[PDB]
Amino acid sequence: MNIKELSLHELCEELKTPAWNVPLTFVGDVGGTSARMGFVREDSVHACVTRYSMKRKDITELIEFFNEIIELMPASVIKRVKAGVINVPGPVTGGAVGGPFNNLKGIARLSDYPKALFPPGRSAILNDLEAGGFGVLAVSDAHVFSEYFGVMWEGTQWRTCEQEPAGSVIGRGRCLVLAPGTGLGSSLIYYNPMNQQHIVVPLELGSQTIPMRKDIDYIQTLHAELKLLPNYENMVSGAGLEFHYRQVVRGSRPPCSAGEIAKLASEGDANACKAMKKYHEYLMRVGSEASMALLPLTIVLVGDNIVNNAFFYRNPQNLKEMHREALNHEMERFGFQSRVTYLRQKKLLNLNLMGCYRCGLDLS
Amino acid sequence: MNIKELSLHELCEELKTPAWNVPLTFVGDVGGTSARMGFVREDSVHACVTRYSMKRKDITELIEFFNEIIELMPASVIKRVKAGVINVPGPVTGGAVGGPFNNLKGIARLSDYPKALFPPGRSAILNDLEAGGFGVLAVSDAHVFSEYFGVMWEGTQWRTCEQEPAGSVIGRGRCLVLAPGTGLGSSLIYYNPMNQQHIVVPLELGSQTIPMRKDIDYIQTLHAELKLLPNYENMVSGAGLEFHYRQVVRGSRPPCSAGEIAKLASEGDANACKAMKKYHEYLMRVGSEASMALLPLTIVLVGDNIVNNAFFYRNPQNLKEMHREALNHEMERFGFQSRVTYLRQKKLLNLNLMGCYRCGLDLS
Numbered sequence: 001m002n003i004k005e006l007s008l009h010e011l012c013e014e015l016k017t018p019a020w021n022v023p024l025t026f027v028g029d030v031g032g033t034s035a036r037m038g039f040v041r042e043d044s045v046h047a048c049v050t051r052y053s054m055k056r057k058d059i060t061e062l063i064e065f066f067n068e069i070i071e072l073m074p075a076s077v078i079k080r081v082k083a084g085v086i087n088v089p090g091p092v093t094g095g096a097v098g099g100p101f102n103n104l105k106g107i108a109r110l111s112d113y114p115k116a117l118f119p120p121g122r123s124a125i126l127n128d129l130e131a132g133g134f135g136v137l138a139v140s141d142a143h144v145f146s147e148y149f150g151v152m153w154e155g156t157q158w159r160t161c162e163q164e165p166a167g168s169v170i171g172r173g174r175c176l177v178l179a180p181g182t183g184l185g186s187s188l189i190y191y192n193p194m195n196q197q198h199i200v201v202p203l204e205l206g207s208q209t210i211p212m213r214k215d216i217d218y219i220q221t222l223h224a225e226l227k228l229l230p231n232y233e234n235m236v237s238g239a240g241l242e243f244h245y246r247q248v249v250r251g252s253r254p255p256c257s258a259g260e261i262a263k264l265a266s267e268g269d270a271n272a273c274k275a276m277k278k279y280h281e282y283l284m285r286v287g288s289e290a291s292m293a294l295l296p297l298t299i300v301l302v303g304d305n306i307v308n309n310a311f312f313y314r315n316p317q318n319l320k321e322m323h324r325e326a327l328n329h330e331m332e333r334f335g336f337q338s339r340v341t342y343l344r345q346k347k348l349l350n351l352n353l354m355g356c357y358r359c360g361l362d363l364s
Numbered sequence: 365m366n367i368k369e370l371s372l373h374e375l376c377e378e379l380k381t382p383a384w385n386v387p388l389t390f391v392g393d394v395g396g397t398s399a400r401m402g403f404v405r406e407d408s409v410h411a412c413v414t415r416y417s418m419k420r421k422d423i424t425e426l427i428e429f430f431n432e433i434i435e436l437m438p439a440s441v442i443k444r445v446k447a448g449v450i451n452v453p454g455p456v457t458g459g460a461v462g463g464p465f466n467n468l469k470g471i472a473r474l475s476d477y478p479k480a481l482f483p484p485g486r487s488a489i490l491n492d493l494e495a496g497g498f499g500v501l502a503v504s505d506a507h508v509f510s511e512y513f514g515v516m517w518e519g520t521q522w523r524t525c526e527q528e529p530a531g532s533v534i535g536r537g538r539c540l541v542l543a544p545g546t547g548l549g550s551s552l553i554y555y556n557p558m559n560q561q562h563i564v565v566p567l568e569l570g571s572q573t574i575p576m577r578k579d580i581d582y583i584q585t586l587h588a589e590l591k592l593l594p595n596y597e598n599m600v601s602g603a604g605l606e607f608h609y610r611q612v613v614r615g616s617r618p619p620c621s622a623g624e625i626a627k628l629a630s631e632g633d634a635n636a637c638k639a640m641k642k643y644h645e646y647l648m649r650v651g652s653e654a655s656m657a658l659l660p661l662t663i664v665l666v667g668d669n670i671v672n673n674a675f676f677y678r679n680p681q682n683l684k685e686m687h688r689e690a691l692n693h694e695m696e697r698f699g700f701q702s703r704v705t706y707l708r709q710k711k712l713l714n715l716n717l718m719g720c721y722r723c724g725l726d727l728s
């Protein structure tokens with residue numbers, strides 16, 4: 001798994017080198033603030049990408065970027081493009097129309113994209129966590145799962161389905177991918193046991209109304225701030241973390257950012273730590289409800305957030321509390337939540353870029 | 365598109381007429397009370413089946429039924445078995461391990477089934493709604509969708525994905541199947557835009573904790589009765605309807621069973637009617653929340669209950685109220701709930717038997 005990030009110029013020069021004299025997949029991982037776009041080739045995977053700023057905060061700006069690449073890149077390179085797959089930070093329909101976005105305006109339309117980078121019949125727009133799910137599969141496919149994912153706790157069902165150690169393979173069962181970052185992303189890597197095939201199913205779990213436990217007052221406190229029935233993302237996100245911190249300090253310390261709160265928690269600050277426990281309590285509730293609804297074999301937490309918050313999961317008291325909340329469901333009296341193995345990304349890797357490429361394989 | 369229930373001996377006879385001198389698919393629709401098993405052949409879908417009482421109330425009695433069938437049947441008939449698929453009223457893993465079940469006792473195990481009816485590599489056990497979802501596909505493939513399904517309302521997304529009228533085909537989009545009957549069943553017919561294929565993913569939406577709207581007291585009341593945080597099935601089931609009717613009458617009238625309540629409502633009783641609106645209010649919350657989480661193109665309400673309570677859905681007032689509640693979600697401010705086309709089964713049909721066959725065709 002190799003990704004190199006280059007200026008657009010160094011990018012152009014890299015693609016003229018012998019190693020890149022080969023069929024290419026155009027890929028793009030588009031976020032609310034930036035996009036990484038470039039080319040990917042083949043059991044190792046090799047991507048070379050350049051970073052763009054989404055300064056105009058508008059999804060149509062990608063069209064301008066694609067043009068730039070086509071004009072600035074030699075035709076010899078562009079003609080090697082066998083497939084073109086990008087991902088965007090919002091719901092996508094028909095792999096062709098993405099929108100509406102929370103942090104960008106406009107609608108991503110595959111039909112308005114240049115066929116030089118998006119060949120007809122071999123092109124797709126993915127949801128970011130749909131690409132991430134494909135990304136998880138690409139890690140598994142390269143026999144390197146244990147290098148990127150660590151077991152948080154092993155579920156009851158793993159040994160029933162798998163002889164190998166937890167975390168060593170994705171496993172022949174449904175894998176629910178959760179990404180608590182800017183937005184709360186989710187996807188279901190469904191497993192069809194009749195053909196032994198994994199299939200990525202995009203979800204919007206973050207946007208469901210939170211069902212209560214013994215926390216009606218806490219939920220109502222947020223309800224009154226937002227003037228909206230809180231959804232999971234409202235508790236599990238940067239603003240969620242900031243909310244949890246305000247609720248812990250109650251005025252006594254002025255507000256700081258989610259980023260600042262995460263830093264303080266890394267330094268042992270009791271208030272920030274408790275905010276972080278709160279944030280994860282709600283993440284574990286997404287997990288327990290989804291564990292029932294989707295009956296997954298595994299749940300995998302992914303993203304730079306998860307990797308960088310390793311200090312939090314490393315702590316056995318934090319981990320035991322998350323485990324307890326994961327089991328906090330009425331259906332656990334039948335063992336449903338206990339079936340599931342939870343894993344977390346433990347090493348940095350842009351799953352989305354790998355996923356766009358992995359998806360391109362299935363179009364080609 | 366037809367199914368004749370026959371006696372065991374006159375099943376054996378029926379399977380000698382020349383029209384049934386074809387490869388056969390063994391199928392079985394296992395309910396809590398009765399199981400219908402038999403054989404299927406082909407635009408045209410012809411099935412003939414015999415019924416068994418599940419009077420051991422034990423899922424394992426099936427093997428005796430299987431054994432009997434093979435004993436009381438020609439080797440000219442058994443030799444034409446190409447596939448074998450049955451469905452059961454509980455979760456199933458690996459398409460081969462069914463249960464534990466809320467209704468029956470034991471575990472359905474494909475490995476303990478006779479290969480004469482279940483040719484290895486061409487057989488499966490399905491969850492009941494997993495089969496239902498396959499049945500919905502089969503109806504659509506037989507170009508007879510509009511004969512069995514009526515539109516309750518057309519969603520915003522339909523005319524952009526399909527040029528055919530709503531209700532006339534399943535549609536090239538995800539279809540969430542809900543079966544609000546004795547239990548609450550749910551499955552997602554996922555549409556894969558990469559390869560234009562539908563796949564059926566089993567769900568357990570019924571067992572999710574109910575998120576609130578403005579009904580905290582009503583939920584607390586049931587919570588106190590059940591001594592369990594209510595899930596959608598608690599509000600949307602037989603037990604659910606009985607609860608709604610009781611909260612309506614407040615001991616002013618006698619307590620009535622679900623069937624009693626249903627009948628009374630059809631006759632025009634105001635209290636029973638109020639109970640059924642209450643029930644459908646919670647059914648619509650399953651739909652609005654799943655509309656966000658799973659982003660379906662359609663939602664199809666299936667089952668005998670649904671056909672038999674056609675009177676309820678035909679009332680323009682009840683339907684308007686259902687529609688209103690289907691859009692009662694904070695995400696509707698973005699049009700998410702409005703995207704979805706709702707349909708209901710309007711004519712009797714064992715989708716599950718048809719589903720077992722349709723599944724079989726993917727297995728051969």
Ligand SMILES: O=C(CCc1ccc(O)cc1)N[C@@H]1[C@@H](O)[C@H](O)[C@@H](CO)O[C@@H]1O
Pocket residue numbers: 089090091099100101102103127128129179182183184185186204206207233698
């Ligand atoms: O933003 C949403 C909900 C839909 C929505 C659309 C417009 C809007 O203004 C408000 C919400 N969903 C996205 C989701 O697609 C993505 O996978 C996730 C991780 O990046 O962040 C958000 O959860």
Ligand SMILES: O=C(CCc1ccc(O)cc1)N[C@@H]1[C@@H](O)[C@H](O)[C@@H](CO)O[C@@H]1O
Pocket residue numbers: 334453454455464465466491492493543547548549550568570571597
């Ligand atoms: O069985 C369950 C949930 C697990 C469960 C286990 C024990 C129990 O007492 C209660 C529920 N769910 C099943 C589901 O598989 C099925 O499709 C649906 C329609 O028949 O009925 C049930 O709701």
